[PDB]
């Protein structure tokens, strides 16, 4: 009992040490121990103090090496041996991180078990070249019709999620993982997206809810949750996306696919600000380092859909940037906006108007496009974009007397807006994405009252399954919409509108 624990603990200090190169603290202030020694010292090398804390050495000054502490100053005191671990920051990579909430070092903070790892690989690894890359054909499906069709996303792709926190910023991200559960079931490991959620500056109480939610929806078993909490030190926060990416490279390398969602790189920036200011390295615009751009570029360009040269595998990424007014002007947004391909712009107005989580999809864009979209889903959702496009313009005359054309647009558009509403943690199969957009396109939703859109949806889907889940199964398996199948589908929808 207490004894079993004692034996373990004593075993854990059994086997005498034998020191080598040390440094000694001259003075320690503000997480910047200034150490005399460490003559040889790799850059970004891990050094372990005699207070046991670990550090990296961002300033290698000529006669003293200004270590950056990954922890509290209380532990450190003057004249403290600072052993040189002699290993650049590395984190385990391997399948053992699957279903594990780990700290940056890789220690399971959920304590679900030690990481099975085939290597520990260094935190910052250079981006894969031009010729290692290949065009993205594979779509990634979030089970949200609007995201999958209006903002078509693939695998390898890096695309922004700029929006305001707690509007279910995390919820939008989580929804994808759940629809990816479907794909995960699908044997191929380009369909097994082993997702990585990088929780930056997020309190343990919140992250406890997240972990539990993932487990609830039984998705925490191909998940990895890299946790750098609000209180967790700024080196850990800074290197947390970098180290996390290295895990991602292992999946990508193995030809598998995975999705890494960095939430929020804004707090990664803030941590770097703390580091830089304390290292006296000048803070850039808005007191946020200027080579934060350089960091973001290195991190985000490791996300790639590889070619068969390096095996066709990928590392999808979805960085999340938190805005306080939608101020894209702000230095950290401007930089990230430039680096990312596509943007998702989630907006408050919609939230109030009952779309929760709320996305303004007029101000969302894709710059990777429908090449990462199902052919079927593309076919029956070109129309949708145009109707909605008109709807935006003709929403600016909606509030009376209106030409029939304008009024018609409003009828289809209001029904569509209601259909595109979605509530947290509801993923929806592609074989049910394809029918719903078709109905709206054919204006079959127009007749069924706005309030009755909700009723229409569930009923329509069940009716489609009853009438022809053969048709639905054809949509899924063929992956393409044969004219005969859309003919039948059109008839089916008409029949459903009738009852």
């Amino acid at each position: 009992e207490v004894s079993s624990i004692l034996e373990e603990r004593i075993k854990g200090v059994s086997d005498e040490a034998n020191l080598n190169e040390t440094g000694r603290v001259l003075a320690v202030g503000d997480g910047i121990a200034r150490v005399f020694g460490l003559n040889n010292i790799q850059a970004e090398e891990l050094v372990e103090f005699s207070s046991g804390v670990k550090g990296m050495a961002l300033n290698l000054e000529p006669g003293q090496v200004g270590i950056v502490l990954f922890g509290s100053d209380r532990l450190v005191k003057e004249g403290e041996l600072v052993k040189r671990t002699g290993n650049i920051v590395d984190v385990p990579v391997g399948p053992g991180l699957l279903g594990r909430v780990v700290d940056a070092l890789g220690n399971p903070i959920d304590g679900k078990g030690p990481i099975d790892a085939a290597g520990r690989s260094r935190a910052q690894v250079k981006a894969p070249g031009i010729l290692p890359r290949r065009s993205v054909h594979e779509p990634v499906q979030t089970g949200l019709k609007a995201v999958d069709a209006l903002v078509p996303i693939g695998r390898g792709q890096r695309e922004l999620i700029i929006g305001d926190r707690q509007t279910g910023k995390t919820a939008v991200a989580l929804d994808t993982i759940l629809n990816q559960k479907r794909w995960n079931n699908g044997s191929d490991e380009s369909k097994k997206l082993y997702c990585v959620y990088v929780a930056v500056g997020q309190k343990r109480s919140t992250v406890a809810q997240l972990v539990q939610t993932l487990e609830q929806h039984d998705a925490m078993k191909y998940s990895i949750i890299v946790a750098a909490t609000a209180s967790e030190a700024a080196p850990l926060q800074y290197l947390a996306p970098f180290t996390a990416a290295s895990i991602g490279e292992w999946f990508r390398d193995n030809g598998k696919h995975a999705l890494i969602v960095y939430d929020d790189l804004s707090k990664q920036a803030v941590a770097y600000r703390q580091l830089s200011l304390l290292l006296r390295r000048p803070p850039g615009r808005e007191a946020y380092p200027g080579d934060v751009f350089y960091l973001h570029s290195r991190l985000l360009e490791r996300a790639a859909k590889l070619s068969e040269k390096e095996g066709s595998g990928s590392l999808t990424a979805l960085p999340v940037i938190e805005t306080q007014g939608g101020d894209v002007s702000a230095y950290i947004p401007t930089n990230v906006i430039s680096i990312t391909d596509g943007q998702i712009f989630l907006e408050a107005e919609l939230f109030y108007k009952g779309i929760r989580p709320a996305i303004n999809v007029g101000l969302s864009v894709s710059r990777v496009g429908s090449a990462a979209q199902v052919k079927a889903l593309k076919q029956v959702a070109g129309s949708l974009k145009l109707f909605l496009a008109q709807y935006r313009e003709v929403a600016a005359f909606a509030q009376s007397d209106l030409d029939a054309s304008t009024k018609q647009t409003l009828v289809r558009g209001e029904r569509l807006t209601q259909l595109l509403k979605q509530n947290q943690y509801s993923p929806l199969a592609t074989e049910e994405q394809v029918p719903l957009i078709y109905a709206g396109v054919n204006g079959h939703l127009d007749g069924i009252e706005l309030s009755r859109i909700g009723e229409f949806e569930s009923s329509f889907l069940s009716y489609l399954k009853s009438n022809h889940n053969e048709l639905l199964t054809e949509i899924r398996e063929k992956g393409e919409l044969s004219k005969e199948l859309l003919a039948s589908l059109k008839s089916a929808t008409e029949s459903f509108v009738a009852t």
């Binding site: 009992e1 207490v2 624990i5 004692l6 005498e16 034998n18």
Partner: protein, 50 residues
């Protein structure tokens, strides 16, 4: 269950002050001498092995 777990933690803390007591025993005795001598010869053994 709650108090049982609390009692188990309390036992570790009770034994923690006992560890401190046992440390004081090392530092007084001519274990203080004998084991320092052991460290000296151990240091010799390691350092000759370098």
């Amino acid at each position: 269950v709650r108090y049982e777990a609390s009692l188990r933690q309390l036992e570790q803390r009770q034994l923690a002050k006992s560890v401190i007591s046992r440390v004081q025993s090392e530092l007084g005795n001519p274990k203080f001498q004998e084991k320092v001598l052991q460290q000296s010869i151990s240091e010799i053994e390691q350092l000759l092995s370098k």
